[PDB]
Amino acid sequence: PADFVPDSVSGMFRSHDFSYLRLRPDHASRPLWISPSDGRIILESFSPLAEQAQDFLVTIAEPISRPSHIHEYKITAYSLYAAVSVGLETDDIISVLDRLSKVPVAESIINFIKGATISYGKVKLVIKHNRYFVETTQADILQMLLNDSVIGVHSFEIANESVEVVKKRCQEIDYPVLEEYDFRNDHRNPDLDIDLKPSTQIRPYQEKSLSKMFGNGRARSGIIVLPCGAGKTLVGITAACTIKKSVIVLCTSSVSVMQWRQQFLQWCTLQPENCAVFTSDNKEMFQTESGLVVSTYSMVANTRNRSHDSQKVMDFLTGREWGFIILDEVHVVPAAMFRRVVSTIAAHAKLGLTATLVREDDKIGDLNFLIGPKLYEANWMELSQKGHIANVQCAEVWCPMTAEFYQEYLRETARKRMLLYIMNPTKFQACQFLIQYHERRGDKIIVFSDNVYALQEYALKMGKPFIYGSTPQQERMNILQNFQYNDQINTIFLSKVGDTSIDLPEATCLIQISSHYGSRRQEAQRLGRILRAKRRNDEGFNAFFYSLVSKDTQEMYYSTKRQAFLVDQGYAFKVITHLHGMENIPNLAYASPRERRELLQEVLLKN
Amino acid sequence: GGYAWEDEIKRSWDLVKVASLVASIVEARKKRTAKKNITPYQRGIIRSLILTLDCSEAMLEKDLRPNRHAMIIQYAIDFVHEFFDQNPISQMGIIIMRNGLAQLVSQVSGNPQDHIDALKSIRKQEPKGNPSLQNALEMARGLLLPVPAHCTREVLIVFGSLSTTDPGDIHQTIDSLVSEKIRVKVLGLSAQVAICKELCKATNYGDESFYKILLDETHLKELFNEAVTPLPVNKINKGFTLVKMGFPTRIFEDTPTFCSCHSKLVYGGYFCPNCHSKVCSLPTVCPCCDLMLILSTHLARSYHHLMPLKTFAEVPTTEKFRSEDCFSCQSRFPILLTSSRYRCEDCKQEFCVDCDVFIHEILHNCPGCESKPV
DNA sequence: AAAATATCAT
DNA sequence: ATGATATTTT
Ligand SMILES: Nc1ncnc2c1ncn2[C@@H]1O[C@H](COP(=O)(O)OP(=O)(O)O)[C@@H](O)[C@H]1O
Ligand code: BEF
Ligand SMILES: [Mg+2]
Ligand SMILES: [Zn+2]
Ligand SMILES: [Zn+2]
Ligand SMILES: [Zn+2]
Ligand SMILES: [Zn+2]
């Protein structure tokens, strides 16, 4: 900022004016704008050099919003650490960024990238038989590290329980800890002989995502983020196959554990001799020299009370050293107790796979020092164009609340407030009409409802099935399998159990009469349930995602806050004030005033 | 046995790292080289063309968006308009190969509206079956029989398939076509075909340049436009003769009268100079005394073919220029490397690039030559 | 069928 | 800190 005349309207911009820097002569070619103060990056995807720019920016930046034309990126310390990790240096990053920038990079930005691009590889952590040695080839630097009281060629054994403490501490200190494991060199750990089946073929983006993890030829821990239905299961299977070591899979739910077992079997050469599932249904353990063990977070994470039969298997899990560990649905690892899974199980390489890297609290960033940096990410819109994930036309139906119903809403307390608008008679009519209309088109409809009471009430009235916690595992699986392969049972209701980590290609439409409090994770996960429809490549096909809300209620506030993640990724919500053809429906629930009054009394009697 | 993942990262950005006016001139000169050679080849102004279109399963392919059938039909409409504008005296007929048989869709006549309407109706028809060159050629051979001898028989097959299912020996038809002096032009769509090449070569006195296969959507229009112009005739072939014709006079009448051609009430028409019968439109054979009625303008349109304007040669940069502005349109020649001046040989007057294209495509007389007093 | 511990949101 | 919902065990 020198020899620059402030603009007359510069007051409109609160010190964010960047007119002092002059536009480059070749600005018509460069696709990037760099904001000095905020560090934001504006990228034009319709200009030359778009494709490789997007790949480069994603590597060095964490995407914020990616609409059709203008992509908004941001640079953070964690993003820079991930970039330098995958075979990159400050010299290359600076040259590329300056080359692609429509305007010269400010000195403030240059300092930010420079600082965090030099600490890559000073401190290393390795795992011997069952003892963790935080060693390094050089001897002088570690001596400085050891002097610190927080931690407690040089190699020293560190307490297994306190491993997380040092990992965070290394992040706090200038030098962050690196997680690399040369699976080719070490053969002491028994090797599992497995390879992808000849029929199987890796998709382009799946190949690229796995390439980043193995860019240097050695496996490195990290998190791979792909849209729901992208195929993270196959990415994990391929990652396990290439390492050729023992692999342990931790999964959110037992139903998904079965999916991993089947998916693993369908897409690799492994035989049942080397597969064992440590789930509630059965505690079978593999006796082979090495193999795959798939379990769930609750079983491994549990500390106080675990049965002796489960204890023996858990001791078996903790006994042998493992080569690979897949943390499926890694968005719940930062939970209070699930963090112990990483520490208890000793694995050289840990890979996290999730579709929605979102968490209400500030614990999402902790993943960078529990598993590894965010290695790769994919655009939801980009995959939709390629035909890998079915297109969805999201909508947010506005259901007005009737006067009799609304008056009781105001007087009631907050906790009782939820049940008034969830059981809105107008909302009930909207749900019935949408289901009837979309059932005519031969479309499978899944109706999520977090409120169990409302879920059951809607299901009983509509004569349709439902799944939630009380339902046993056998019944839940039977409904899932039946709904997939039976014409009569075209629609099934669900609850919070089915929100995340379930595969069902048949589902194409989707509704939510009720939902949990404002939380972007559940919205994205529920939307992803219908993003893998098998009939996604058919010409002129569009899946549907309906969100029923009550006007003037707190649900409107939550719904707007509950779809922020989808808006950032690219999805757009359309407001449907009027549903055409609803009046002509011969039968509508709670049409008569007496029925509405009876329902109001019934719902009020709940509390 | 390591996979491609372990090798390295692609590093796409590494691939990208950080004279036109003369190029256009030399490119124009290379293109102008093909136009340098031009001689007044004798061409048959009067012609009868039978347009054969392939409507078979091969048309359902999406090589030409939206489908081959749609693009061929659409460009056929344009060809019909262009063909009858450049050649007013000529007559045309339309045939289509469908369901393994040749189906006639419009009788050979000289009315462009009838042919345009026939093609428009074919739009909805869904192509199916296999094509049959022999059936189309046999039907075309019959159609070109009543045509007068002085007329030059012509067949323009738009073939799209790769195989032909005929009921008989197609080689006999090729010999028969040569006997009747019928020249066949084939516009293939996918790849060369042995029979198609033989048919064109045999009927065109051994010339192999009458069988063309396009390479993209754009090239199709150029191939269609080329067939509009009349074809040259060989020295050995003789068809010199006179044709009786008359020029009727437009007549204005207060009360409508019956037309001899269509027996319909029309306010105006052209009175024949032999039988005084009125005809709605021109140029058509008189319905009563069967002498082709035409206006002087119809003959005029074809004069430029007989005596084409000689191509212009770009002046060398070293040599001096006649003037600083274009003779015709008075547009200053840009100062620029290589002078962009073209002079006509006969009158030696420079012209601009816009005039050079205009004076040889739309306007068929050099402005300088007419201005020169003899 | 009842207990007890986690998780996710106020 | 509390209330729902879910999961695991006895
Ligand atoms: N390469 C592939 N070819 C075909 N189908 C694939 C491929 N990769 C993944 N899929 C399919 O994608 C669907 C969802 O995969 P999954 O791993 O469950 O997704 P998520 O990322 O939500 O965990 C499954 O039906 C699976 O068969
Ligand atoms: F992201 Be998936 F639906 F597990
Ligand atoms: Mg999954
Ligand atoms: Zn008439
Ligand atoms: Zn007459
Ligand atoms: Zn000119
Ligand atoms: Zn001249």
Coordinates of N, CA, C and O in Angstrom, one line a residue, chain B residues 22 26-27 66 103 149 225 231 255 274 310 319 326 335 338:
Chain B
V22 N 1.0 -13.0 -40.7 CA 1.7 -13.6 -41.9 C 1.2 -15.1 -42.0 O 1.1 -15.6 -43.1
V26 N -0.1 -16.7 -45.6 CA 0.4 -17.9 -46.2 C -0.7 -19.0 -46.2 O -0.8 -19.7 -47.2
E27 N -1.5 -19.1 -45.2 CA -2.6 -20.0 -45.2 C -3.6 -19.7 -46.3 O -4.1 -20.5 -47.0
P66 N -28.5 -34.4 -34.0 CA -28.9 -35.4 -32.9 C -28.8 -36.8 -33.4 O -28.5 -37.7 -32.7
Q103 N -38.3 -46.2 -52.0 CA -39.7 -45.6 -52.0 C -39.6 -44.2 -52.6 O -38.8 -43.4 -52.2
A149 N -33.5 -35.8 -73.9 CA -32.1 -36.2 -74.1 C -31.1 -35.1 -73.8 O -30.1 -35.4 -73.2
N225 N -23.1 -28.4 -50.7 CA -23.1 -27.2 -51.5 C -22.4 -27.4 -52.8 O -22.7 -26.8 -53.9
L231 N -22.0 -30.2 -63.3 CA -20.8 -31.0 -63.5 C -20.3 -30.8 -65.0 O -21.1 -30.6 -65.9
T255 N -60.3 -10.0 -62.6 CA -61.1 -11.1 -62.2 C -60.2 -12.4 -62.3 O -59.5 -12.6 -63.3
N274 N -47.5 -19.5 -77.1 CA -48.0 -20.4 -78.2 C -49.4 -20.7 -78.1 O -50.1 -20.6 -79.1
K310 N -11.7 -14.8 -63.8 CA -10.4 -15.3 -63.5 C -10.0 -14.9 -62.1 O -10.2 -13.8 -61.6
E319 N 6.8 -4.7 -55.2 CA 6.2 -3.8 -56.3 C 5.3 -2.7 -55.7 O 4.7 -2.9 -54.7
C326 N -9.1 0.7 -51.8 CA -9.7 -0.3 -52.7 C -10.5 0.4 -53.8 O -11.2 1.4 -53.5
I335 N -1.6 -0.9 -43.4 CA -0.1 -0.8 -43.6 C 0.6 -2.1 -43.2 O 1.5 -2.6 -43.9
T338 N 3.4 -8.2 -45.4 CA 3.0 -8.5 -46.8 C 1.8 -7.7 -47.2 O 0.8 -7.7 -46.4

